[PDB]
Amino acid sequence: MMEQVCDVFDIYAICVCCKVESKNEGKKNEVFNNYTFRGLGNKGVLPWKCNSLDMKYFCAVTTYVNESKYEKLKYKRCKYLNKEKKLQNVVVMGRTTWESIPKKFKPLSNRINVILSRTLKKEDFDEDVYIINKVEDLIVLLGKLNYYKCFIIGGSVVYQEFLEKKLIKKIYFTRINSTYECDVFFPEINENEYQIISVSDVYTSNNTTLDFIIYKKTNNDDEEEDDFVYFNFNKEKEEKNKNSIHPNDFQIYNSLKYKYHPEYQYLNIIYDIMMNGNKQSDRTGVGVLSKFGYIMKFDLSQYFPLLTTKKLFLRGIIEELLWFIRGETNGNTLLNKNVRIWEANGTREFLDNRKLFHREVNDLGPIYGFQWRHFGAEYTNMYDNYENKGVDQLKNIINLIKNDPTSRRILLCAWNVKDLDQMALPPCHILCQFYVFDGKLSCIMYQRSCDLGLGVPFNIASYSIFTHMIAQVCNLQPAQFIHVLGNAHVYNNHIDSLKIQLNRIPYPFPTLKLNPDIKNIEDFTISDFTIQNYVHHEKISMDMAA
Template sequence: MQTSEKTYLDMCRYIMDHGERKGDRTGTGTLSTFGYQMRFDLSEGFPLLTTKKVPFRLIKSELLWFLKGDTNIRYLLQHNNNIWNEWPFKRWIESSDYKGPDMTNFGIRSQQDEGFNEQYKEQMDKFKERILADESFAHTYGDLGNVYGKQWRNWESSQGEWIDQIQQVIQDIKTKPDSRRLIVSAWNPEDIAPERAALPPCHVLFQFYVVNGKLSCQLYQRSGDVFLGVPFNIASYALLTHLIAEECGLEVGEFIHTLGDAHIYTNHVEQVKTQLAREMKPLPSISINMEGKSVFEVETDDIELNGYDPHPRIKAPVAV
């Protein structure tokens, strides 16, 4: 039996059984636990959940977006990736330039009112179309601020210098593989204010570790939406580990996922119960074509998922 997915499902069961009820920024409410760690042996297979379908194409394009240092959703929309839309849309509908119907609390209202949900989808579609068609509008309303891509590739120091953390960590893995400083941080205290970043980084820091020709990665994530977000995070950092290992001529080892506030939103509880009732299937594998390319030049077509046969998707609302 594969253990990677069981590790995740065990966390879901633990939070369902032992999680404390807490309020949250979105007003939805959660079952929460503090401090939880999962380990995934990447030689066992690629840790993409099989008890529900997780769209790997979105994980690919988001990670490559991070690695390019991009922070504007225009690239994501060009790849039919909608997972970051709600945050710039919120800024748009709260701006003085927006003249459409009232979209206040659209995340919750769209789940409760079918008529409003149709209005919301119409306004979101118009927003996306304008982001794709109007470069000036995209520049103003499509940018998420100083989020992951900015911090990974263009960290600005207090001295006004620019630091490419990903390029630096790749160089250090190649030249100083025993270093205990193979770290990339996305948490810049200056940039967590809403006017500087749409959302403060949830996955705040990761560290690489090299031993016996294998590359492992540990992520510290301050906040994890266990049903919707964490499956993406697991697969994304597993993919990142594969990409960096390929760049550095190493095999893959483990991905270790350490969570601060690990929570299940109260409006995801029934979906989690559905998932826990399903049987796990064999894990897929991935293949990466990096011939003649650096990790920064890889495109979505260079990464293929093989043998993925999951149970159907389980829909759930995003808390914004």
């Protein structure tokens, strides 16, 4: 039992890193990895001006102490040293870091401040702080103090040396998802030395998304708890596919303690379907694992929910969206933009098997577009006018949001029962419902059929984008985008690729920027959309057929 020093004295490291401004000239396809976030400082200060949320997080971690837990800690440290006034944490920093703290904040409040330095000695300081000219001295000092936990708070030189010596039990690492000029960086973490064990929710602060992750040092009333064991007596049956699906293939996924990154709502569903889904076979013979009824919520005010565990592009879906909004049903419009989302559903073969023998190739019929702007009108062909015919649902919801915010009747429905058979294929996205409160807009979209491996990722982006669009032209701030899944399935084809995916740890979501000028839902164009700071894993082919 070779007791590790970082465990005895509970020495942790907490930092924050942004993306480095390194030259990515040559390939528009930038590769990403955890080492993407490593910019620590610039010209003696932080690359970014400031970050309120990160600061709030920092303050909360380094000042929180658990009185009751100290009792044990003391025993631990004493026996390690063979030994038998409000509790505070210790914060240790390089001299350069200390000299960057504004005088009105020196020393860090409610914390025992320790400073590393050779050029300066205690006489050179006016504040209540401890000065040490060597690492070993820290261990000595900790042995003589009464503290909860000890946090190494920078800078690069200090993080560097504490990591080599393996004196860090954990690393509270903040990932600022934006680029800035840097001259100082955090050391490249060794994945065989440190593994991520927790990922936080994603937030926005000072014009940038960010999350919090925790790296751990890689290995190598009490009675009411029994009423629980009793209450779980009938949980006799477990995962029907656990055999066909070996949890051992989700090593990383199951090794994570806290999985709060919103992307996990998508990822956990994939897991649930794989571990408990029912085996079924759809129309062509392809098999699937299925479950019924799920709900996912994304905070569009905090980030754009574009999956990061694989690569996605949105040009196509944005064009589809603009295509929907124009009321179009002409598949060629999309194909002339090299968007093939609908190409397969408009062929001669496809149309004929739908019994649409009298439908021109690529004329998709009364689908989404047609329903949003002309529900109820008799469809003729994709070239017809239809001006002022049928119900313009889109304009209606826009007016309801503007003039009757609290209405509980703001829905956009595509499932026109009468037109179903005339459609190339019935709509998957049945309807959208909006909610308005305190100047914010939320949207609920009900999806009847859901291809988790290929479809859902794009669907989430589509409606999140749509919500931003409606909210803007109605002079509102987008809030939540609720996604309700009906028949949720995973095609057998996608399993091996999804297993890979579930083992990738999410990156902080990127953000969506809309041209602020656009004021009418119809005046948007492809160039009015900007997806910024999209950090993602390499793309995957859900289908590995060759």
